[PDB]
């Protein structure tokens, strides 16, 4: 898509070369925002074939409050493999924080139930937020949260969402993150009987890895096609019981997949 | 300032009317970003006169870990009085989260000295973050954190910072919030022997209150003046040892002050 390809070109034209924790090397910029009107289509990139079943299984895994890759393995999704301990655990990452933020006093906060109840009982609230940046638990995590903090907003019957992503792999992780959160806004709007508005993406250290330069140049020479449409086949009795079968994308015609080395 | 007056005009041209917890009513946009190059000048608005005293004393108060207004009273700062209880207390707001975020197991994390240690030993980290958004303590706070989350970045010997502000009173609070953070970026750069880079402001619910519209069009009819210059007269032993007198603003020639009521 055009917003995405523009950001790729901006990192190649303006990026500063940095040494990163993996010793791979990076071209980097700081501070970027992009806006996706969800009325205009599902923001799934078309200049390379994205694999939607990993995106939706990971999100359903987050909403169930789970931090073990077993569910993901039952569904053949491999994305979290090299960050899990010998027992399949990643520590209190996203799922644990969304569904059960631990207080110092033993209790737990369910930020997703809280956000649902806010959108239904108080839509004008300027605090409809969920954070995964639990400073008291970052130590205990296999990886610190990249998509750290997000906020929902309602205006004329429409639900918007803004993500703060502190660390972004433009070639590999960012297509995956945009579609994952656009999916969540569609699920939330359906449970809350609202229309979809904008998905706003804001990034911190926004970067392209040195060994992704050829892959980037190939994608950057491809023309963006029309965006797909997301069909949610049934309306579940809560945001905690959607299943892989409920989601469909008509009109998705992408360019070939493009393989790229993952950095660990 | 140019960026600032452009934002006021954007929420006027594109904002939608919203009801809010204070009952006052607001014009509102969601999702905005702007960049202040701190090498160009200190970003203190010139289209109306701003009170530096309260900005500097509130930052110094935050950095001490203090959440009681007694300090602010010893210095004639009354900006936090409406929210403070009978004992001068605001609950675990900014100062406490910044200096002593409580973990699930007894511990307390000082996010400011962690950030200083990362800028010295690891300035290319993508994790140099301070969060005030402690989900576990929100209900003990006088008010939920508006300037909620921020991130530092280093590139060509320069320190940059991006703030996510979830709720923003564009007329009354935002002049205060960008001078406060630009000041923190100069204090941090001075401590780490870095030069100043960019302050990136990102807003969630960015708004103008209904009873601020004539003041806003009044300000908006004024040409921005030359941006002031910050002179720090001393290099203290630590970020916690700065004093009001160490800072001098040079060349601040603002248009007349404009009074406006605070929403409850
Ligand atoms: C973001 C996020 C979640 N994640 C987690 C995650 C964890 C560590 C990371 N590390 C690095 N260096 N980059 C990433 O983008 C990244 C992403 C993902 C993990 C892998 C792929 C990936 O390699 N994508 C391939 C194949 C995926 C598939 O078969 O579906 C692709 O071609 O798209 C995508 C997302
Ligand atoms: C942001 C922040 C901290 N705060 C805290 C804070 C708390 C609640 C709020 N509530 C509302 N509705 N708007 C705010 O901007 C706001 C700000 C402030 C509080 C008061 C003033 C204020 O009245 N301003 C000056 C007027 C002139 C000037 O701007 O210089 C004053 O009289 O002191 C500014 C900042
Ligand atoms: O959801 C995610 C997770 C990780 N990353 C990137 C950030 C950095 O490049 C590396 C490790 O966090 O993978 C993303 O872009 N998105
Ligand atoms: O740092 C601050 C604190 C408060 N506000 C505004 C937000 C909202 O309009 C009201 C209450 O949080 O005051 C700001 O803009 N900045």
Coordinates of C-alpha atoms and ligand atoms in Angstrom, one line a residue:
Chain A
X1 CA 0.0 0.0 0.0
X2 CA 1.0 3.6 -0.7
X3 CA 1.4 4.8 2.9
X4 CA 3.6 1.8 3.7
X5 CA 5.8 2.0 0.5
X6 CA 6.3 5.7 1.3
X7 CA 7.6 4.9 4.7
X8 CA 10.0 2.2 3.2
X9 CA 11.4 4.9 0.8
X10 CA 11.7 7.4 3.7
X11 CA 13.9 4.9 5.7
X12 CA 16.2 4.3 2.7
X13 CA 16.4 8.0 1.9
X14 CA 16.7 9.4 5.4
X15 CA 17.7 6.6 7.7
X16 CA 20.8 6.6 9.9
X17 CA 22.9 3.5 10.1
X18 CA 22.8 1.9 13.5
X19 CA 24.4 -1.1 15.2
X20 CA 21.6 -3.1 16.9
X21 CA 21.5 -5.8 19.6
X22 CA 21.8 -8.6 16.9
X23 CA 24.9 -7.1 15.2
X24 CA 22.9 -7.2 11.8
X25 CA 22.9 -3.5 11.2
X26 CA 19.9 -1.2 10.6
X27 CA 18.8 1.9 8.6
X28 CA 16.8 3.9 11.1
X29 CA 14.4 6.8 11.6
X30 CA 12.6 8.0 14.7
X31 CA 9.0 9.3 14.8
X32 CA 6.5 8.5 12.1
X33 CA 2.7 8.3 11.8
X34 CA 0.4 6.8 9.2
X35 CA -3.4 6.8 8.8
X36 CA -5.6 4.1 7.5
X37 CA -9.2 4.8 6.8
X38 CA -10.8 1.4 7.4
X39 CA -13.9 2.4 5.4
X40 CA -11.6 2.3 2.3
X41 CA -10.6 -1.4 2.7
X42 CA -8.7 -3.8 4.9
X43 CA -5.0 -2.6 5.2
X44 CA -3.4 -5.9 4.2
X45 CA -0.3 -5.2 1.9
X46 CA -0.7 -6.2 -1.7
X47 CA 2.9 -5.6 -2.9
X48 CA 3.8 -9.0 -1.4
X49 CA 1.6 -11.9 -0.3
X50 CA 0.9 -11.7 3.3
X51 CA -0.2 -14.8 5.3
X52 CA -3.4 -14.0 7.2
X53 CA -3.7 -17.2 9.2
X54 CA -0.6 -16.4 11.4
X55 CA -2.0 -12.9 11.9
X56 CA -5.5 -13.9 13.0
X57 CA -4.2 -16.9 15.2
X58 CA -1.7 -14.7 17.0
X59 CA -4.5 -12.1 17.8
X60 CA -7.0 -14.7 19.0
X61 CA -4.1 -16.1 21.1
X62 CA -3.6 -12.6 22.7
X63 CA -7.3 -12.1 23.5
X64 CA -7.4 -15.5 25.3
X65 CA -4.7 -14.2 27.7
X66 CA -2.2 -16.9 26.6
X67 CA 1.6 -16.6 26.6
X68 CA 2.5 -20.2 25.5
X69 CA 3.1 -21.1 21.9
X70 CA 1.2 -24.4 22.2
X71 CA -2.1 -23.0 20.8
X72 CA 0.0 -21.5 17.9
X73 CA 1.6 -24.9 17.3
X74 CA -1.8 -26.6 17.1
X75 CA -2.6 -24.2 14.3
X76 CA 0.8 -24.5 12.5
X77 CA 1.9 -21.0 13.2
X78 CA 5.6 -20.7 13.7
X79 CA 6.2 -16.9 14.3
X80 CA 7.1 -17.1 18.0
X81 CA 9.2 -20.3 17.9
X82 CA 12.7 -18.9 18.6
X83 CA 11.7 -16.8 21.6
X84 CA 9.9 -19.5 23.7
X85 CA 11.7 -21.4 26.6
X86 CA 11.9 -25.3 26.5
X87 CA 8.3 -25.5 27.8
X88 CA 6.9 -23.2 25.1
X89 CA 6.5 -20.1 27.4
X90 CA 7.4 -16.4 26.6
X91 CA 6.8 -15.0 30.1
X92 CA 4.1 -12.3 30.8
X93 CA 4.0 -10.8 27.3
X94 CA 1.0 -9.3 25.4
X95 CA -1.8 -11.8 26.3
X96 CA -1.0 -11.8 30.1
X97 CA -1.0 -7.9 30.1
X98 CA -4.2 -7.4 28.0
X99 CA -6.2 -9.9 30.1
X100 CA -4.6 -9.9 33.5
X101 CA -2.4 -7.0 34.4
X102 CA -1.1 -7.9 38.0
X103 CA -1.4 -5.3 40.8
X104 CA 1.2 -5.2 43.7
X105 CA -1.7 -6.2 45.9
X106 CA -2.5 -9.7 44.3
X107 CA -5.4 -8.6 42.1
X108 CA -5.6 -8.5 38.2
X109 CA -7.0 -6.0 35.7
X110 CA -8.7 -7.1 32.5
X111 CA -8.0 -4.3 30.2
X112 CA -10.0 -5.8 27.3
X113 CA -13.2 -6.2 29.4
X114 CA -12.5 -2.7 30.7
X115 CA -12.2 -1.3 27.2
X116 CA -15.4 -3.2 26.0
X117 CA -17.3 -1.8 28.9
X118 CA -15.9 1.7 28.2
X119 CA -17.0 1.7 24.6
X120 CA -20.5 0.6 25.5
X121 CA -21.1 2.7 28.7
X122 CA -18.8 5.7 28.1
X123 CA -17.8 6.1 24.3
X124 CA -16.5 9.7 24.7
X125 CA -13.9 8.7 27.2
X126 CA -10.3 9.9 26.5
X127 CA -8.9 7.0 28.6
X128 CA -10.0 3.9 26.4
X129 CA -6.5 2.4 26.6
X130 CA -4.7 -0.8 26.8
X131 CA -1.0 -1.0 27.6
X132 CA 1.3 -4.0 27.4
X133 CA 4.3 -2.0 28.8
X134 CA 4.3 -3.3 32.3
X135 CA 7.6 -1.9 33.7
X136 CA 7.4 -4.2 36.7
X137 CA 7.4 -7.3 34.4
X138 CA 9.7 -6.5 31.4
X139 CA 12.5 -8.5 33.0
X140 CA 10.3 -11.6 33.0
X141 CA 9.6 -11.3 29.3
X142 CA 11.4 -13.2 26.4
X143 CA 11.1 -10.0 24.4
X144 CA 10.0 -6.4 25.5
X145 CA 6.6 -5.5 23.8
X146 CA 7.0 -3.7 20.4
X147 CA 3.4 -2.8 20.0
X148 CA 3.4 -1.3 23.4
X149 CA 0.4 0.9 23.9
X150 CA -2.9 1.6 22.2
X151 CA -5.9 3.8 22.4
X152 CA -9.5 3.6 21.1
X153 CA -11.6 6.6 20.2
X154 CA -15.3 7.0 19.2
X155 CA -16.7 10.0 17.2
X156 CA -19.8 10.0 14.9
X157 CA -20.8 6.3 15.6
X158 CA -17.2 5.3 14.4
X159 CA -14.4 3.4 16.2
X160 CA -10.8 4.5 15.7
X161 CA -7.6 3.1 17.1
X162 CA -4.1 4.4 17.5
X163 CA -1.0 2.2 18.1
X164 CA 2.3 3.3 19.6
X165 CA 4.9 0.9 18.3
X166 CA 8.3 1.6 19.9
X167 CA 10.3 -0.7 17.7
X168 CA 9.4 -1.5 14.1
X169 CA 10.9 -3.8 11.5
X170 CA 9.4 -2.1 8.4
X171 CA 9.9 -5.1 6.0
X172 CA 8.9 -8.0 8.2
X173 CA 6.9 -7.0 11.3
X174 CA 5.0 -3.9 10.2
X175 CA 2.6 -5.5 7.5
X176 CA 1.7 -8.1 10.2
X177 CA 1.1 -5.4 12.9
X178 CA -1.1 -3.2 10.7
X179 CA -3.4 -6.1 9.8
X180 CA -3.5 -7.4 13.3
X181 CA -4.8 -4.2 14.8
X182 CA -7.2 -3.4 11.9
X183 CA -8.6 -6.9 12.6
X184 CA -9.1 -5.9 16.3
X185 CA -10.9 -2.6 15.5
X186 CA -13.3 -4.6 13.2
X187 CA -13.9 -7.1 16.1
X188 CA -14.4 -4.3 18.7
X189 CA -16.7 -2.3 16.4
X190 CA -18.9 -5.4 15.7
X191 CA -19.2 -6.2 19.5
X192 CA -19.9 -2.6 20.3
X193 CA -22.3 -2.0 17.4
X194 CA -20.2 0.7 15.9
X195 CA -18.9 1.6 12.5
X196 CA -15.1 1.4 11.7
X197 CA -13.1 4.6 11.5
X198 CA -9.3 5.0 11.3
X199 CA -6.3 2.9 12.2
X200 CA -3.5 5.3 13.2
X201 CA 0.0 3.9 13.4
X202 CA 2.7 5.8 15.2
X203 CA 6.3 4.5 15.4
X204 CA 9.3 5.0 17.6
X205 CA 12.6 3.5 16.2
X206 CA 11.3 2.7 12.7
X207 CA 13.9 0.6 10.9
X208 CA 15.0 -1.6 8.0
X209 CA 17.6 -4.3 8.5
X210 CA 20.8 -4.3 6.3
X211 CA 20.1 -7.8 5.0
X212 CA 16.6 -6.7 3.8
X213 CA 17.9 -4.1 1.2
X214 CA 17.3 -6.4 -1.9
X215 CA 13.9 -7.5 -0.7
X216 CA 12.9 -3.8 -0.1
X217 CA 14.1 -2.7 -3.6
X218 CA 12.1 -5.5 -5.2
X219 CA 8.9 -4.6 -3.3
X220 CA 9.5 -0.8 -3.9
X221 CA 9.3 -1.5 -7.7
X222 CA 5.8 -3.1 -7.5
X223 CA 2.5 -1.3 -7.9
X224 CA 0.0 -1.4 -5.0
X225 CA -3.3 -3.1 -5.9
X226 CA -6.9 -2.3 -4.5
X227 CA -7.3 -3.3 -0.8
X228 CA -9.4 -6.4 0.2
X229 CA -12.6 -6.5 2.2
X230 CA -13.0 -8.1 5.5
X231 CA -16.1 -10.3 6.1
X232 CA -16.9 -11.4 9.7
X233 CA -19.2 -14.4 8.9
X234 CA -21.0 -14.6 12.3
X235 CA -21.3 -12.3 15.3
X236 CA -20.0 -14.1 18.5
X237 CA -21.5 -13.6 21.9
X238 CA -18.3 -11.9 23.0
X239 CA -14.9 -10.8 21.8
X240 CA -13.4 -13.9 23.5
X241 CA -15.1 -16.4 21.2
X242 CA -14.1 -15.5 17.6
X243 CA -12.6 -18.5 15.7
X244 CA -10.4 -18.7 12.6
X245 CA -13.4 -19.7 10.5
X246 CA -15.2 -16.3 11.2
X247 CA -12.9 -14.3 9.0
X248 CA -12.7 -13.8 5.2
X249 CA -11.0 -11.5 2.7
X250 CA -12.7 -10.9 -0.7
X251 CA -10.7 -9.0 -3.4
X252 CA -7.2 -10.0 -2.1
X253 CA -5.0 -10.0 -5.1
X254 CA -1.3 -9.6 -4.0
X255 CA 2.1 -9.7 -5.9
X256 CA 4.4 -12.8 -5.1
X257 CA 5.3 -13.5 -1.4
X258 CA 9.0 -12.4 -1.1
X259 CA 11.2 -14.4 1.4
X260 CA 13.5 -12.5 3.9
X261 CA 15.9 -13.6 6.8
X262 CA 14.5 -13.0 10.3
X263 CA 16.8 -11.3 12.8
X264 CA 17.3 -12.8 16.4
Chain B
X1 CA 4.6 28.7 17.0
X2 CA 4.0 27.6 13.4
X3 CA 3.4 23.8 14.3
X4 CA 1.2 24.8 17.2
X5 CA -1.1 27.3 15.2
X6 CA -1.4 24.7 12.4
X7 CA -2.7 22.2 15.0
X8 CA -5.3 24.7 16.3
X9 CA -6.5 25.3 12.7
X10 CA -6.6 21.5 12.0
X11 CA -8.9 20.7 15.0
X12 CA -11.1 23.7 14.0
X13 CA -11.2 22.6 10.3
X14 CA -11.5 18.9 11.0
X15 CA -12.7 18.4 14.6
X16 CA -16.0 16.8 15.5
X17 CA -18.1 18.0 18.5
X18 CA -17.7 15.8 21.5
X19 CA -19.2 15.5 24.9
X20 CA -16.6 15.0 27.7
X21 CA -16.3 14.1 31.5
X22 CA -16.2 17.8 32.5
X23 CA -19.6 18.4 30.7
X24 CA -18.0 21.5 28.9
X25 CA -18.1 20.1 25.3
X26 CA -15.0 20.0 23.0
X27 CA -14.0 20.2 19.3
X28 CA -11.9 17.0 18.7
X29 CA -9.5 15.3 16.3
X30 CA -7.8 11.9 17.0
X31 CA -4.2 11.2 16.1
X32 CA -1.7 13.9 15.3
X33 CA 2.1 14.3 15.2
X34 CA 4.5 17.2 15.1
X35 CA 8.3 17.7 15.4
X36 CA 10.3 20.5 17.1
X37 CA 13.9 20.7 16.2
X38 CA 15.4 21.9 19.4
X39 CA 18.5 23.3 17.7
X40 CA 16.2 25.9 16.0
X41 CA 15.2 27.4 19.4
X42 CA 13.4 26.7 22.7
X43 CA 9.8 25.8 21.8
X44 CA 7.9 28.1 24.1
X45 CA 4.8 29.6 22.3
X46 CA 5.1 33.3 21.4
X47 CA 1.5 34.0 20.1
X48 CA 0.5 34.5 23.8
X49 CA 2.7 34.9 27.0
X50 CA 3.5 31.7 28.8
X51 CA 4.5 31.4 32.5
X52 CA 8.0 29.6 32.6
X53 CA 8.1 29.5 36.4
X54 CA 5.3 26.9 36.7
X55 CA 6.7 24.8 33.8
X56 CA 10.2 24.5 35.4
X57 CA 9.0 24.0 39.0
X58 CA 6.5 21.3 37.8
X59 CA 9.3 19.4 36.0
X60 CA 11.7 19.7 39.0
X61 CA 8.8 18.4 41.2
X62 CA 8.2 15.4 38.9
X63 CA 12.0 14.5 38.9
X64 CA 12.0 14.5 42.7
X65 CA 9.3 11.7 42.8
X66 CA 6.9 14.1 44.6
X67 CA 3.1 13.9 44.3
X68 CA 2.1 16.4 47.0
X69 CA 1.6 20.1 46.0
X70 CA 3.4 21.6 49.1
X71 CA 6.6 22.1 47.1
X72 CA 4.6 23.8 44.3
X73 CA 3.0 26.1 46.9
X74 CA 6.4 27.1 48.5
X75 CA 7.2 28.3 44.9
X76 CA 3.8 30.0 44.0
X77 CA 2.7 27.3 41.6
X78 CA -1.0 26.8 41.9
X79 CA -1.7 24.9 38.6
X80 CA -2.4 21.5 40.4
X81 CA -4.7 22.8 43.3
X82 CA -8.1 21.8 41.9
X83 CA -7.1 18.1 41.8
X84 CA -5.4 17.8 45.1
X85 CA -7.1 16.5 48.2
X86 CA -7.3 18.1 51.7
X87 CA -3.6 17.1 52.4
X88 CA -2.2 18.5 49.1
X89 CA -2.0 15.0 47.6
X90 CA -2.7 13.9 44.0
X91 CA -2.1 10.1 44.4
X92 CA 0.6 8.1 42.5
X93 CA 0.7 10.5 39.5
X94 CA 3.8 11.3 37.3
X95 CA 6.5 11.8 39.9
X96 CA 5.9 8.5 41.7
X97 CA 5.7 6.4 38.5
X98 CA 8.8 8.0 37.0
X99 CA 10.9 7.4 40.1
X100 CA 9.3 4.5 41.9
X101 CA 7.0 2.3 39.7
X102 CA 5.8 -0.5 42.0
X103 CA 6.4 -4.1 40.7
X104 CA 4.3 -7.2 41.7
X105 CA 7.1 -8.5 44.0
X106 CA 8.0 -5.7 46.4
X107 CA 10.5 -3.8 44.1
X108 CA 10.3 -0.3 42.7
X109 CA 11.8 0.8 39.4
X110 CA 13.3 4.2 38.9
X111 CA 12.6 4.8 35.2
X112 CA 14.6 8.1 35.1
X113 CA 17.9 6.6 36.3
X114 CA 17.3 3.5 34.1
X115 CA 16.9 5.9 31.0
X116 CA 20.1 7.8 32.0
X117 CA 22.0 4.4 32.3
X118 CA 20.7 3.3 28.9
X119 CA 21.7 6.6 27.2
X120 CA 25.3 6.3 28.6
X121 CA 25.9 2.5 28.0
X122 CA 23.4 1.6 25.3
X123 CA 22.2 4.7 23.4
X124 CA 21.1 2.6 20.4
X125 CA 18.6 0.6 22.4
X126 CA 15.0 0.7 21.1
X127 CA 13.7 0.2 24.7
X128 CA 14.6 3.7 26.3
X129 CA 11.2 4.4 27.6
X130 CA 9.4 6.0 30.6
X131 CA 5.7 5.1 31.2
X132 CA 3.4 6.9 33.6
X133 CA 0.5 4.6 32.6
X134 CA 0.4 2.2 35.5
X135 CA -2.9 0.3 35.0
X136 CA -2.6 -1.1 38.5
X137 CA -2.6 2.4 40.1
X138 CA -4.9 4.5 37.9
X139 CA -7.8 4.4 40.4
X140 CA -5.6 5.9 43.1
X141 CA -4.7 8.9 40.9
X142 CA -6.4 12.4 41.1
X143 CA -6.4 12.4 37.4
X144 CA -5.2 9.7 34.8
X145 CA -1.8 10.5 33.1
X146 CA -2.3 12.8 30.0
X147 CA 1.4 12.7 28.9
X148 CA 1.5 9.1 29.4
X149 CA 4.5 7.5 27.6
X150 CA 7.7 8.7 26.1
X151 CA 10.7 7.4 24.3
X152 CA 14.3 8.6 23.8
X153 CA 16.5 8.0 20.7
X154 CA 20.1 8.9 19.8
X155 CA 21.5 9.4 16.3
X156 CA 24.3 11.7 15.1
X157 CA 25.4 12.6 18.7
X158 CA 21.9 14.1 19.2
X159 CA 19.1 13.3 21.8
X160 CA 15.6 13.0 20.5
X161 CA 12.4 12.3 22.3
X162 CA 8.8 11.3 21.3
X163 CA 5.9 11.8 23.6
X164 CA 2.5 10.1 23.4
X165 CA -0.1 12.3 25.0
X166 CA -3.5 10.5 25.2
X167 CA -5.6 13.6 26.0
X168 CA -4.7 17.1 25.1
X169 CA -6.2 20.5 25.9
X170 CA -4.7 22.3 22.9
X171 CA -5.3 25.8 24.2
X172 CA -4.3 25.5 27.9
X173 CA -2.2 22.4 28.5
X174 CA -0.2 21.8 25.2
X175 CA 2.0 25.1 25.5
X176 CA 2.9 23.7 29.0
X177 CA 3.5 20.1 27.9
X178 CA 5.9 20.9 25.0
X179 CA 8.1 23.4 26.9
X180 CA 8.3 20.8 29.9
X181 CA 9.5 18.0 27.7
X182 CA 11.9 20.2 25.6
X183 CA 13.4 21.2 29.0
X184 CA 13.8 17.5 30.0
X185 CA 15.5 16.7 26.7
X186 CA 18.1 19.6 27.4
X187 CA 18.6 18.4 30.9
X188 CA 19.2 14.8 29.8
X189 CA 21.5 15.8 26.8
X190 CA 23.6 18.0 29.2
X191 CA 23.9 15.0 31.6
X192 CA 24.9 12.6 28.8
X193 CA 27.2 14.9 26.8
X194 CA 24.9 14.8 23.8
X195 CA 23.6 17.7 21.7
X196 CA 19.8 18.2 21.4
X197 CA 17.9 16.7 18.5
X198 CA 14.1 16.5 18.0
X199 CA 11.1 16.6 20.3
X200 CA 8.3 14.7 18.5
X201 CA 4.8 15.3 19.9
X202 CA 2.1 12.7 19.2
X203 CA -1.5 13.1 20.4
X204 CA -4.5 10.8 20.9
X205 CA -7.6 12.8 21.7
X206 CA -6.5 16.3 20.7
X207 CA -9.0 18.9 21.6
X208 CA -10.2 22.5 21.9
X209 CA -12.9 23.2 24.7
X210 CA -16.1 25.1 23.5
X211 CA -15.4 28.0 25.9
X212 CA -12.0 28.5 24.3
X213 CA -13.0 29.3 20.7
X214 CA -12.7 33.2 20.8
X215 CA -9.3 33.0 22.6
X216 CA -8.2 30.4 19.9
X217 CA -9.2 32.6 16.9
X218 CA -7.7 35.6 18.7
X219 CA -4.3 33.8 19.1
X220 CA -4.6 32.4 15.6
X221 CA -4.7 35.9 14.1
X222 CA -1.2 36.6 15.5
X223 CA 2.1 36.1 13.6
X224 CA 4.7 33.8 15.6
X225 CA 7.7 35.7 16.9
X226 CA 11.4 34.6 17.1
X227 CA 11.7 31.5 19.2
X228 CA 13.5 32.0 22.5
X229 CA 16.9 30.4 23.5
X230 CA 17.6 28.3 26.6
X231 CA 20.9 28.9 28.5
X232 CA 21.8 26.4 31.3
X233 CA 24.3 28.1 33.6
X234 CA 25.6 24.9 35.3
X235 CA 26.2 21.2 34.8
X236 CA 24.9 19.6 38.1
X237 CA 26.2 16.2 39.3
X238 CA 22.9 14.5 38.4
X239 CA 19.6 15.1 36.7
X240 CA 18.0 15.4 40.2
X241 CA 20.2 18.3 41.3
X242 CA 19.0 21.1 39.0
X243 CA 17.6 24.3 40.4
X244 CA 15.3 27.0 39.0
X245 CA 18.2 29.5 38.8
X246 CA 20.3 27.3 36.6
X247 CA 18.0 28.1 33.6
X248 CA 17.8 31.3 31.7
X249 CA 15.5 32.1 28.8
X250 CA 16.8 34.6 26.3
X251 CA 15.0 36.5 23.6
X252 CA 11.4 35.8 24.7
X253 CA 9.2 38.5 23.3
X254 CA 5.6 37.2 23.3
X255 CA 2.2 38.7 22.3
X256 CA -0.2 39.6 25.2
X257 CA -1.4 36.8 27.5
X258 CA -4.9 35.4 26.8
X259 CA -7.0 34.2 29.8
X260 CA -9.2 31.1 29.5
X261 CA -11.1 28.9 32.1
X262 CA -9.9 25.5 33.1
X263 CA -12.3 22.5 32.7
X264 CA -13.1 20.6 35.9
Ligands
LIG1 C1 5.0 -8.4 14.1 C2 4.9 -9.5 14.5 C3 4.8 -10.9 14.9 N1 6.0 -11.7 14.6 C4 6.9 -11.6 15.8 C5 8.2 -10.9 15.6 C6 9.2 -11.3 16.5 C7 10.6 -11.0 16.2 C8 10.9 -10.3 15.1 N2 12.2 -10.0 14.8 C9 12.5 -9.3 13.7 N3 13.8 -9.1 13.4 N4 11.6 -8.9 12.9 C10 10.3 -9.1 13.1 O1 9.4 -8.4 12.3 C11 9.9 -9.8 14.2 C12 8.6 -10.2 14.5 C13 6.3 -12.2 13.4 C14 7.4 -13.2 13.4 C15 7.8 -13.6 12.1 C16 7.3 -13.1 10.9 C17 7.9 -13.5 9.7 O2 9.0 -14.0 9.6 N5 7.1 -13.3 8.6 C18 7.3 -14.1 7.3 C19 6.7 -15.5 7.5 C20 5.4 -15.6 8.3 C21 4.4 -16.6 7.9 O3 4.7 -17.7 7.4 O4 3.2 -16.3 8.0 C22 6.6 -13.4 6.2 O5 7.0 -13.6 5.0 O6 5.7 -12.6 6.4 C23 6.3 -12.1 11.0 C24 5.8 -11.7 12.2
LIG2 C1 -0.3 20.8 31.1 C2 -0.1 21.0 32.3 C3 0.0 21.2 33.7 N1 -1.4 21.7 34.2 C4 -2.2 20.6 34.7 C5 -3.5 20.3 34.1 C6 -4.5 19.7 34.8 C7 -5.9 19.7 34.4 C8 -6.2 20.4 33.2 N2 -7.5 20.5 32.8 C9 -7.8 21.1 31.7 N3 -9.1 21.2 31.2 N4 -6.9 21.6 30.9 C10 -5.6 21.5 31.2 O1 -4.6 21.9 30.3 C11 -5.2 20.9 32.4 C12 -3.9 20.9 32.9 C13 -1.7 23.0 34.0 C14 -2.7 23.6 34.8 C15 -3.2 24.9 34.6 C16 -2.6 25.7 33.5 C17 -3.0 27.0 33.4 O2 -4.1 27.5 33.8 N5 -2.3 27.8 32.6 C18 -1.7 29.1 33.1 C19 -2.3 30.1 32.1 C20 -1.2 30.8 31.2 C21 -0.1 30.0 30.6 O3 -0.5 29.0 29.9 O4 1.0 30.3 30.7 C22 -1.8 29.6 34.6 O5 -2.7 30.4 34.9 O6 -1.0 29.1 35.4 C23 -1.6 25.1 32.7 C24 -1.2 23.8 32.9
LIG3 O1 5.3 -7.2 16.6 C1 6.5 -7.0 16.4 C2 7.6 -7.6 17.1 C3 8.9 -7.3 16.7 N1 9.1 -6.4 15.7 C4 10.6 -6.2 15.4 C5 11.2 -5.1 16.2 C6 12.7 -5.4 16.1 O2 13.2 -5.1 14.8 C7 12.7 -6.9 16.3 C8 12.6 -7.4 17.8 O3 11.6 -6.7 18.6 O4 11.5 -7.3 15.6 C9 8.2 -5.7 15.0 O5 8.4 -4.9 14.1 N2 6.9 -6.1 15.4
LIG4 O1 -0.5 17.5 31.1 C1 -1.7 17.7 30.9 C2 -2.7 17.4 31.8 C3 -4.1 17.7 31.4 N1 -4.3 18.1 30.2 C4 -5.8 18.2 29.9 C5 -6.4 17.0 29.2 C6 -7.9 17.2 29.4 O2 -8.5 18.2 28.6 C7 -7.9 17.7 30.9 C8 -7.9 16.7 32.0 O3 -6.9 15.7 31.9 O4 -6.7 18.5 31.0 C9 -3.4 18.4 29.2 O5 -3.6 18.7 28.1 N2 -2.1 18.1 29.6

